[PDB]
Amino acid sequence: LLACLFGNGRCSSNRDCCELTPVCKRGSCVSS
């Protein structure tokens, strides 16, 4: 069980973020 391989606020898709942040909008991870 590991849903977090980034640890930052920048991404390229929803799955590119961590568990605490299941959304990726504007190329930035967010918690919805």
**CATH code where residue 9 lies:** 4.10.40.10
Distances 8 to 2, 19, 25, 28 between C-alpha atoms, Å = 16, 12, 13, 9
Give the span between the Cα atoms of 2 and 26, in whole angstroms.
24
SS (HEC) of the chain: CCCCCCCCCCCCCHHHCCCCCCEEECCEEECC
Q: How many domains are there within the chain?
A: 1
Check the CA dihedral 7-2-19-10 and report its sign. Answer: positive
Look at the chain and count its residues: 32
- 27 in Cβ contact with 13 (< 8 Å): no
Q: Which domain range does residue 3 map to?
A: 1-32
